[PDB]
Amino acid sequence: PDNPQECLLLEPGLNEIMANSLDYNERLWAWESWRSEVGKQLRPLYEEYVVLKNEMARANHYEDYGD
Amino acid sequence: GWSTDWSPYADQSIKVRISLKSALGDKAYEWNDNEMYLFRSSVAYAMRQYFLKVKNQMILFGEEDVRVANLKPRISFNFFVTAPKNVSDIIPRTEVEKAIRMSRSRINDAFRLNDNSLEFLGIQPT
Amino acid sequence: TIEEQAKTFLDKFNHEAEDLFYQSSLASWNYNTNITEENVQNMNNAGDKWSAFLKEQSTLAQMYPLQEIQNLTVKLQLQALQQNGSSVLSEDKSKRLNTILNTMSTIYSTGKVCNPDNPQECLLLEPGLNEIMANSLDYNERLWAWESWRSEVGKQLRPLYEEYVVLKNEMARANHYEDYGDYWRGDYEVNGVDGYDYSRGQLIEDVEHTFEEIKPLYEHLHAYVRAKLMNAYPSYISPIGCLPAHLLGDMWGRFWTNLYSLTVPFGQKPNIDVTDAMVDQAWDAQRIFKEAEKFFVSVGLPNMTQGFWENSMLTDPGNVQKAVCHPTAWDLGKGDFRILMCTKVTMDDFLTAHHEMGHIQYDMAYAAQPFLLRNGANEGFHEAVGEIMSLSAATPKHLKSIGLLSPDFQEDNETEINFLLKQALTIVGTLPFTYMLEKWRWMVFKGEIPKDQWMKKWWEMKREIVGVVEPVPHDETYCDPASLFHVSNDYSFIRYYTRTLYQFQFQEALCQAAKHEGPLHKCDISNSTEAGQKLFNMLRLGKSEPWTLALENVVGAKNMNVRPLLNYFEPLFTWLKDQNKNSFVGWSTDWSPYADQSIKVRISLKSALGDKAYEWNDNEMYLFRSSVAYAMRQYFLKVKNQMILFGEEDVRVANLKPRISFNFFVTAPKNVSDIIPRTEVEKAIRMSRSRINDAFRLNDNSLEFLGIQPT
Amino acid sequence: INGFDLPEGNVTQENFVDMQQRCNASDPAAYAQLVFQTCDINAFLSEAVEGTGLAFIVFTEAITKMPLSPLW
Ligand SMILES: *[C@@H]1O[C@H](CO)[C@@H](O[C@@H]2O[C@H](CO)[C@@H](O)[C@H](O)[C@H]2NC(C)=O)[C@H](O)[C@H]1NC(C)=O
Ligand SMILES: *[C@@H]1O[C@H](CO)[C@@H](O[C@@H]2O[C@H](CO)[C@@H](O)[C@H](O)[C@H]2NC(C)=O)[C@H](O)[C@H]1NC(C)=O
Ligand SMILES: *[C@@H]1O[C@H](CO)[C@@H](O[C@@H]2O[C@H](CO)[C@@H](O)[C@H](O)[C@H]2NC(C)=O)[C@H](O)[C@H]1NC(C)=O
Ligand SMILES: *[C@@H]1O[C@H](CO)[C@@H](O[C@@H]2O[C@H](CO)[C@@H](O)[C@H](O)[C@H]2NC(C)=O)[C@H](O)[C@H]1NC(C)=O
Ligand SMILES: *[C@@H]1O[C@H](CO)[C@@H](O[C@@H]2O[C@H](CO)[C@@H](O)[C@H](O)[C@H]2NC(C)=O)[C@H](O)[C@H]1NC(C)=O
Ligand SMILES: *[C@@H]1O[C@H](CO)[C@@H](O[C@@H]2O[C@H](CO)[C@@H](O)[C@H](O)[C@H]2NC(C)=O)[C@H](O)[C@H]1NC(C)=O
Ligand SMILES: *[C@@H]1O[C@H](CO)[C@@H](O[C@@H]2O[C@H](CO)[C@@H](O)[C@H](O)[C@H]2NC(C)=O)[C@H](O)[C@H]1NC(C)=O
Ligand SMILES: CCNC(=O)CCc1cccc(Br)c1
């Protein structure tokens, strides 16, 4: 939030914070920011994914994708 | 064991009850997400005013800083305010209560409600 | 001694400086041709040592004043060392200012614009945003890149620039200067030289006067380009209005060169490209450099020093080691002249050879001057010299005689109009931009423009001087000027303006000596020894004498004159006026690309609220945009059954007045190009008009949505 | 106040005519298009009504701008 030029991905930057950083604020930032930036981008996709996946499994003679 | 009710944000959360039909009866608009969007915007407006007046601090509070929880068909919900770009920085309930008090009339006006219908639990008229 | 001890200090400094400087210059040259971490440290150490030496000498200079100094040479050198600069500011102030500078530069250099469709795709300016503003012709794409650039880096630079201006002004005032702008205008200012004395404010007067002289030619250029822009971008340019800033062929619209593609006077007529004949004659970077050398010798200017040929990067290293390819006329000093560039067998490279070697000619000419007097008369002198060299080489006659152009070649007047227009796009195009930017900065530094009116006056000046209109309204949160490199990296711009004038004055003067009988636009000063003499007179002079006197050395004048520039474009001018006979020539400072869907909204408080009427502030305005967003969301989710997440940011408010009147146009949540039509917006307004009134305790009479009629 | 976006209540009876010419000087092209009525109180008195109008046009109107209009 301070410097927009420094943007961490999950694999190394966010993971090292969540694994090492002992700062409530820093940890809260990483956690929340990950869900707020990437988690929203997956919401609509995941919804469609569920629908198509169920269809396929139902057509493969299954109650749902879980079954 | 654990209690599934404690939250890290419950402490500064203000409960809000909304009584449209109590103050409107007929022509009582349905509270939708748009009404909620308007509410978060109204709270942000108040926080800004309070800060710029009492603290002389031009803090750019947005509807996104207004974190709403436990939304119920009673139109009751719990909200807390955070810093404009700092999830960690939670605006203390005291300041938020003062901000509400200051602009309560304005908020009531925006929802055609009144202190009675717009129950800001913990804030009261005098 | 006093004058004698002052000279003694300067002499000692000059001797030591030359060697210490040599190290720094050589060290950098080595790295520039090597690009090795080892060489990084080498040049770094050399630079620190060299810089430290200069600092120490600056302190020594202070001891000896300039009043008792009578000899100009010693006086000038002393002034050039005595300059304290940011040292005058306190350590804390200097450090902060440095931090501001570093932050601004870092933001500009490393700022990224993510694509709205896919956030994972983010473009930096140099690689991506530049290839859009220069190549992409999509109105929406161009708008996106333009708006996003100012909506990200520019916003971040806003607070930095503000502090930067304060610290710079402090330093200038502490260095005995009116403002940081006055600090910059010191370059041309000349004192104690009778009949050559110049003033910082005089520079301003001269630039403004000369700008008025080029005004008409620019007007015709704008009118012609406007017509072409209208064809390239239908329903995006009004024939009587300004030009959308995102359609000027680059990010800031500094040059109109890219517009040449759509503004070509005669599409059928191409431009002379010897890049093929060169390859056919097995031309080489070395060949073109020798040709540049021969060009200078033809006008009497001396041949490149044999040593230069021995130590000059005149092509791509293309080996285990890499080198900077940027054309650079290196002057390591102590009689050391070099050129670093990855040049190829290209007509451009051929002309670049003449340009770079022209700088070397100037360097060699003033090489005999004192260490502190070895430089161009003013900031716009050295670059101008380089420009005329490339111009003379570019002349078809030069190419034809050198064999690059066929002797049988016939230069059609249409092809000549093509050439001239392309040049006007690069020259006449940048004159208003450069003038308006320096005017704005000068006013900002001297406090003419209050911080609350920075963006306001920026776009007013853009609409008036340059005839360019913002595709979207930008409040003081935006810092569009800072979004440019020179502003963000603390550089002067008036240099470019003055250089352009000087260049044409020089070329014309040399043409007069060359006895050229053709148009100045196609004047070839090659094979003109006498012209070389005039150029050389100022060349050898260096900084020993005033720039006004150096102008007399070649052009034979004191102040810059734009008449030669106008003369050069006179053929094009006649053609432009002919093409603009039917079209409107000018622009409306009132036309906006967003005015059509803009709804004017007057808020009346004393009429309705009267006593206990709330004051309309930014928070009141925040509430209003939020209220409009609410209405748009409701309208879409109900009438069109579309839950669109409209936000106050989509509410583009403009023309705010103390009457609480403003114009607003709703746009798409994440698409600046998608602006919601006034009709649909009016429907949303009417649907929630009651609720909006409630939010401000106002009514239809007090809350006037002009055009939205209450019933 | 509209044609010149003046702050509401900046212009009053105390400062109309001086702000007419002032604003005229500021922007005459954007002042000429403004249309002003000859608001003179004296004329409003010499404005006699013909016929039965004193009861059905003058009194009946004035009554509507007096609280207890129905009683009046
Ligand atoms: C995989 O594909 C085959 C091919 O159609 C499916 O077999 C059919 O299944 C349906 C439903 O039992 C029958 O009505 C068809 O007559 C079958 N056709 C053939 C050619 O076998 C099979 O069911 C598919 N697998 C699943 C699990 O759905
Ligand atoms: C972001 O929010 C956190 C949580 O409020 C801040 O951390 C505290 O900030 C206050 C005021 O700066 C200090 O008095 C506390 O000592 C801080 N320590 C804690 C909670 O970690 C943090 O400073 C804020 N950072 C930014 C960027 O605004
Ligand atoms: C200013 O100083 C320069 C520097 O010495 C003087 O130039 C010299 O003039 C004398 C007399 O002709 C020569 O013998 C020296 O060789 C010159 N030296 C250099 C390095 O230029 C110049 O004459 C002085 N002029 C004034 C105004 O005092
Ligand atoms: C740069 O620094 C020098 C060094 O102090 C300044 O020269 C002094 O100026 C003051 C004011 O006239 C005198 O009282 C001192 O005696 C001077 N000292 C010396 C040794 O030069 C000079 O004015 C400063 N210039 C700028 C650009 O601020
Ligand atoms: C400048 O003058 C030189 C001197 O003649 C020109 O060089 C010649 O060019 C012609 C055309 O190719 C040749 O036929 C001659 O043999 C060349 N002579 C020499 C001695 O170089 C040069 O072309 C002239 N440049 C211009 C622009 O006119
Ligand atoms: C280049 O010169 C020719 C010669 O005049 C121009 O051709 C003329 O164009 C005008 C405009 O269409 C006609 O009215 C004339 O009758 C033409 N004359 C001849 C003899 O061709 C041509 O337009 C010019 N091209 C440029 C640079 O504009
Ligand atoms: C964003 O909005 C703009 C304008 O609504 C869209 O651009 C238009 O696209 C249509 C279809 O190709 C064209 O016919 C119009 O001429 C375009 N308008 C302009 C001003 O050029 C654009 O496609 C939308 N893009 C996104 C990101 O949704
Ligand atoms: C109905 C016809 N009468 C009039 O128009 C005027 C009468 C009238 C008006 C005011 C006071 C008195 Br006393 C009488």
- CB atoms < 10 A from the CB of C80, how many? 17
Distance CA C157, CA C34 (A): 34
The DSSP symbol for B18 reads: E
- Give residue for tokens 């001297």: C446
Q: Cα(first)–Cα(last) distance of chain A, in Å?
A: 43
Nearest to B37, CA basis, from B75, B69, B60, B68: B68
**Do residue B38 and residue C627 have CB atoms under 8 angstroms apart?**
yes
The finding on whether C71 has its CB within 6 A of some atom of ligand 3 is yes
Distance CA C73, CA C68 (A): 13
Contact C461, C435 (CB under 8 A): no
Measured in degrees and rounded to the nearest 5, phi and psi for residue C139 equal -45, -50
- Kind of pairing between the strands at C651-654 and C599-603: unpaired
Helices (H), C175-281: 180-185, 200-232, 260-263, 275-280
The finding on whether B86 has its CB within 6 A of some atom of ligand 2 is yes
Tell me which chain C residues have a C-beta less than 8 angstroms from the C-beta of A7: 112
Contact C381, C550 (CB under 8 A): yes
Cβ–Cβ contact A41 with C under 8 A = yes
What secondary structure does DSSP assign to C92-126, as a single string? HHHHHHHHHHHHHHHHHHH-EEE-SS-TT-EEEII
Question: Whose C-alpha lies nearest to ligand 4, atom 25?
Answer: C175
Contact C440, C481 (CB under 8 A): yes
**Do residue A5 and residue C152 have CB atoms under 8 angstroms apart?**
no
* Run of H or E residues at B89: strand B86-90
Contact C517, C523 (CB under 8 A): no
Bridge partners, C124 (sequence order): C112
- Which own/partner contact pairs does C207-215 have at CB distance under 8 Å and 24+ positions apart? C207/C435, C207/C438, C207/C494, C207/C497, C207/C498, C208/C435, C210/C501, C210/C560, C210/C561, C210/C562, C211/C431, C211/C432, C211/C435, C211/C465, C213/C562, C213/C563, C213/C566, C214/C428, C214/C431, C214/C562, C214/C565, C214/C566
- CB atoms < 10 A from the CB of C168, how many? 24
Pocket test for ligand 7, best of C674, C676, C680, C681 (most atoms within 8 A of CB): C674
Cβ–Cβ contact B48 with C under 8 A = yes
CA angle B55, B57, B60 (to 5 degrees): 135
Helices C200-232 and C413-426: angle between axes, nearest 10 degrees: 120
- CB atoms < 10 A from the CB of C145, how many? 22
Method: cryo-EM
**Tokens representing C319?**
């080996």
Q: Is C486 a catalytic residue?
A: yes
Bridge partners, C244 (sequence order): C469
Distance CA C290, CA C349 (A): 12
Nearest to C650, CA basis, from C111, C116, C251: C116
Contact C598, C663 (CB under 8 A): yes
* b/e sequence C213-252, b meaning 16+ C-beta within 10 Å: ebeebbbbbbbbbbbbbbebbeebbbeebbbbbbbbbbbb
**Residue C156 distance to chain B (closest CA, Å):** 14
Gaps after residue numbers in chain D (C–N over 2.5 angstroms): none
Contact C416, C192 (CB under 8 A): no
Relative to the CA of C413, which ligand 6 atom is closest? 27
**Pocket around ligand 7: residues whose beta carbon is below 6 Å from it?**
C 116, 139-140, 671, 673-674
Nearest to A34, CA basis, from A57, A51, A11: A11
Nearest to C578, CA basis, from C215, C227, C213: C227
Contact C586, C219 (CB under 8 A): yes
Catalytic residue among C222, C474, C486, C516: C486
Q: How far is the CA of C202 from the centre of ligand 3 (A)?
A: 32
**Tokens representing C601?**
């909204």
**Do residue B48 and residue C622 have CB atoms under 8 angstroms apart?**
yes
Q: CB within 8 A of A36, min separation 6: which ones?
A: none
For residue D52, the ligand closest to its alpha carbon is 8
**Do residue B109 and residue C695 have CB atoms under 8 angstroms apart?**
yes
Q: Half-sphere exposure (CA, 13 Å, Cβ side) for C502?
A: 30
Contact D3, D30 (CB under 8 A): yes
The amino acid at C397: K
Q: How far is CA C510 from CA C332, C389, C534, in A?
A: 29, 11, 7
**Do residue C694 and residue B34 have CB atoms under 8 angstroms apart?**
no
- The answer to the question of whether A35 is labelled as a binding residue is yes
Q: Is C163 a catalytic residue?
A: no
Declared resolution, Å: 2.8
Question: Whose C-alpha lies nearest to ligand 2, atom 26?
Answer: B86
Q: How far is the CA of C71 from the centre of ligand 3 (A)?
A: 9
What's the sign of the alpha-carbon dihedral C299, C301, C307, C308?
Answer: negative
- CB atoms < 10 A from the CB of C590, how many? 11
- Give residue for tokens 């000093």: C333
For residue A60, the ligand closest to its alpha carbon is 1
Q: Half-sphere exposure (CA, 13 Å, Cβ side) for C551?
A: 22
Bridge partners, B80 (sequence order): B67
Q: How far is the CA of C554 from the centre of ligand 3 (A)?
A: 25
Q: How far is the CA of A50 from the centre of ligand 1 (A)?
A: 23
**Tokens representing A2?**
């301070």
Task: Please provide the size of chain B in residues.
Answer: 126
Nearest to B13, CA basis, from B74, B72, B64, B82: B82
Q: How far is CA C50 from CA A50, C10, C46, C126, in A?
A: 68, 16, 6, 32
C21: three-class secondary structure by DSSP: helix
Nearest to C479, CA basis, from C107, C26, C82: C107
- CB atoms < 10 A from the CB of C319, how many? 7
Q: CB within 8 A of A42, min separation 6: which ones?
A: none
- CB atoms < 10 A from the CB of C612, how many? 7
Distance CA C262, CA A19 (A): 56
Nearest to C413, CA basis, from C519, C284, C492: C519
Distance CA C498, CA C502 (A): 6
